[PDB]
Amino acid sequence: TSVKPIFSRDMNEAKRRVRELYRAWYREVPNTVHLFQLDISVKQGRDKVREMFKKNAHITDPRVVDLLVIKGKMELEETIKVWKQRTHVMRFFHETEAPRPKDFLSKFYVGHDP
Amino acid sequence: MNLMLALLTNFTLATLLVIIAFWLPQLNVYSEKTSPYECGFDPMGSARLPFSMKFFLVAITFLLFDLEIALLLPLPWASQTANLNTMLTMALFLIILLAVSLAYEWTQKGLE
Amino acid sequence: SMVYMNIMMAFTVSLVGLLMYRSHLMSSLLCLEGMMLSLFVMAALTILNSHFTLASMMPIILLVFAACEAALGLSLLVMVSNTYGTDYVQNLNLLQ
Amino acid sequence: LTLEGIKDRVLYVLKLYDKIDPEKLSVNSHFMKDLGLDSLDQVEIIMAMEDEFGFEIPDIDAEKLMCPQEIVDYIADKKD
Amino acid sequence: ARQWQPDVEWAEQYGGAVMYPTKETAHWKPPPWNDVDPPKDTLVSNLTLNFGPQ
């Protein structure tokens, strides 16, 4: 592997960097719930964040984790400020979309092998 | 005794036409979505009203130029008079006394 | 007559509890400029029926200072909000 | 300024989190070797000290604490 | 040396906050040795207007 990294070196500065920005998002859940005038319960906004970080824990490599940092670092520009007009935030909460079957027999009635 | 019935006509005709527009033909109980909208063609303004210095000095400066036109106001009544060397030389004083108050402030106005 | 009792009852727009209190100090500077016209009128009712012919220049001059006075006092009330943003008369630091 | 008053504050934090720890107010909960959590979930627990008793959580010490003994001891030389 | 007792404690007992003579009360504050400017808090994030699809 002959390529320079982005920020980290090996497995330790990376896995303290990802723990840094989690304390930003944990602080900046109960701000946007009134900064956009959106009416839900505040514990919903904290459940989505602790859901989202456990998704990517299958990585065995540096600078891939560092790539996800840059996306995670960027969103705190728009979210902590007011650049999303109430609608780009609420797309994480799929309220409209109908539930998927996800079990074998219910797929077999409706749909040609999804 | 009409001065005083020369204006209470004019204000009761004024308040008539506003309540036959704001009230009466109005009452919006249907859908009338008064949600979070109506925010003056914008969004949420989390900042309050900030102080602006260059728009305070415009208030005070006018007020001190407004006073001594009321001193200057009875100049046409000061014509049909007695001793008039006094009346001329005192009338010219206040205007210069208004003029110097420019020229001192005129060396520092700012972007007004 | 009764045109002097009202208004001498209306001179009690000082009333000193509401001449510096409570907070939003603009409410207190309000009745300092509103204490005039209880002096501008109470003079004007007396000079005018009793034909003095000369003292009626004094109600004209009564406004000219009290306008310039209160304008000075309003300059400093920006300076208390230039340092804070709120006037709030329960600001006190220099004891006595 | 009381050494026991900071042992108060550390020892009603943990069950106030409705997650893993079941009323274990021991000082010897050693947090993913005695108690048992995820590596991510401890990071929440440290953050509560800014508004509860007042604190900064400055540095890499949050990767180091791992027990409410060590939480009190770093608060101990922080204040008294 | 010998002459009298010009001791240190006569400066701190006269130590200037309020001169608590016969009791201790809600003292003022160790008043500033320089000219008096503690409360420096003057800042605002200026207005964020969008002259956008207006």
UniProtKB/Swiss-Prot annotation, chain B:
Reactions it catalyzes: a ubiquinone + NADH + 5 H(+)(in) = a ubiquinol + NAD(+) + 4 H(+)(out)
This protein's UniProt keywords: Electron transport, Formylation, Membrane, Mitochondrion, Mitochondrion inner membrane, NAD, Respiratory chain, Translocase, Transmembrane, Transmembrane helix, Transport, Ubiquinone
GO biological process, one term: mitochondrial electron transport, NADH to ubiquinone
Membrane topology term: Multi-pass membrane protein
Family to which the UniProt record says this protein belongs: Belongs to the complex I subunit 3 family.
EC number(s) per entry: 7.1.1.2
Major localization class: mitochondrion
Sequence intervals crossing the membrane: 3-23, 55-75, 84-104
Highest taxon, organism lineage: Eukaryota
Record text on subunit structure and interactions: Core subunit of respiratory chain NADH dehydrogenase (Complex I) which is composed of 45 different subunits. Interacts with TMEM186. Interacts with TMEM242.
PTM sites of type N-formylmethionine: 1
Family annotation (Gene3D superfamilies): NADH:ubiquinone/plastoquinone oxidoreductase, chain 3
PANTHER family according to UniProt: NADH-UBIQUINONE OXIDOREDUCTASE CHAIN 3 (PTHR11058:SF9)
Location of the protein in the cell: Mitochondrion inner membrane
Taxonomic placement: Eukaryota, Metazoa, Chordata, Craniata, Vertebrata
Keyword Ligase: no
Protein name: NADH-ubiquinone oxidoreductase chain 3
Functional note: Core subunit of the mitochondrial membrane respiratory chain NADH dehydrogenase (Complex I) which catalyzes electron transfer from NADH through the respiratory chain, using ubiquinone as an electron acceptor. Essential for the catalytic activity of complex I.
Any one GO MF annotation of this record: NADH dehydrogenase (ubiquinone) activity
Gene Ontology annotations for the cellular component aspect, listed alphabetically: mitochondrial inner membrane; respiratory chain complex I
UniProtKB/Swiss-Prot annotation, chain C:
This protein's GO CC annotations: mitochondrial inner membrane; respiratory chain complex I
Protein name, as recorded: NADH-ubiquinone oxidoreductase chain 4L
Annotated TM spans: 1-20, 28-48, 60-80
Catalyses which reaction(s): a ubiquinone + NADH + 5 H(+)(in) = a ubiquinol + NAD(+) + 4 H(+)(out)
Residues making up the signal peptide according to the UniProt record: none
GO biological process: ATP synthesis coupled electron transport
Species annotation: Bos taurus (Bovine)
Entry keyword Transmembrane helix: yes
Superkingdom of origin organism: Eukaryota
From Swiss-Prot, chain D:
Residues recorded with modification N6-acetyllysine: 15
GO molecular function: acyl binding; acyl carrier activity; fatty acid binding; mitochondrial large ribosomal subunit binding; NADH dehydrogenase (ubiquinone) activity; oxidoreductase activity
Gene Ontology, cellular component aspect: mitochondrial matrix; mitochondrial membrane; mitochondrion; respiratory chain complex I
Superkingdom: Eukaryota
Keyword Isomerase found: no
Keywords, comma-separated and alphabetical: Acetylation, Electron transport, Fatty acid biosynthesis, Fatty acid metabolism, Lipid biosynthesis, Lipid metabolism, Mitochondrion, Phosphopantetheine, Phosphoprotein, Respiratory chain, Transit peptide, Transport
Location of O-(pantetheine 4'-phosphoryl)serine modifications: 39
One GO term (biological process): mitochondrial electron transport, NADH to ubiquinone
Similarity comment: family membership: Belongs to the acyl carrier protein (ACP) family.
Quaternary structure note: Mammalian complex I is composed of 45 different subunits. Interacts with ETFRF1. Identified in a complex composed of MALSU1, MIEF1 upstream open reading frame protein and NDUFAB1; within the trimeric complex MIEF1 upstream open reading frame protein functions as a bridging scaffold that interacts with MALSU1 on one side, and with NDUFAB1 on the other side. The complex interacts with the mitochondrial large ribosomal subunit. Interacts with alpha-1-microglobulin chain; this interaction is required for the maintenance of mitochondrial redox homeostasis.
Protein known as: Acyl carrier protein, mitochondrial
Organism of derivation: Bos taurus
Residue numbers of the full-length protein present here: 74 to 153 of 156
From Swiss-Prot, chain E:
Gene this chain is encoded by: NDUFS2
Family in the record: Belongs to the complex I 49 kDa subunit family.
Subunit structure: Core subunit of respiratory chain NADH dehydrogenase (Complex I) which is composed of 45 different subunits. Component of the iron-sulfur (IP) fragment of the enzyme. Interacts with NDUFAF3. Interacts with NDUFAF7. Interacts with CERS2.
Compartments reported by the entry: Mitochondrion inner membrane
Role according to the record: Core subunit of the mitochondrial membrane respiratory chain NADH dehydrogenase (Complex I) which catalyzes electron transfer from NADH through the respiratory chain, using ubiquinone as an electron acceptor. Essential for the catalytic activity and assembly of complex I. Redox-sensitive, critical component of the oxygen-sensing pathway in the pulmonary vasculature which plays a key role in acute pulmonary oxygen-sensing and hypoxic pulmonary vasoconstriction. Plays an important role in carotid body sensing of hypoxia.
Organism: Bos taurus
The protein, known as: NADH dehydrogenase [ubiquinone] iron-sulfur protein 2, mitochondrial
Residues that bear N6-acetyllysine: 29
Shown residues in whole-protein numbering: 34 to 87 of 463
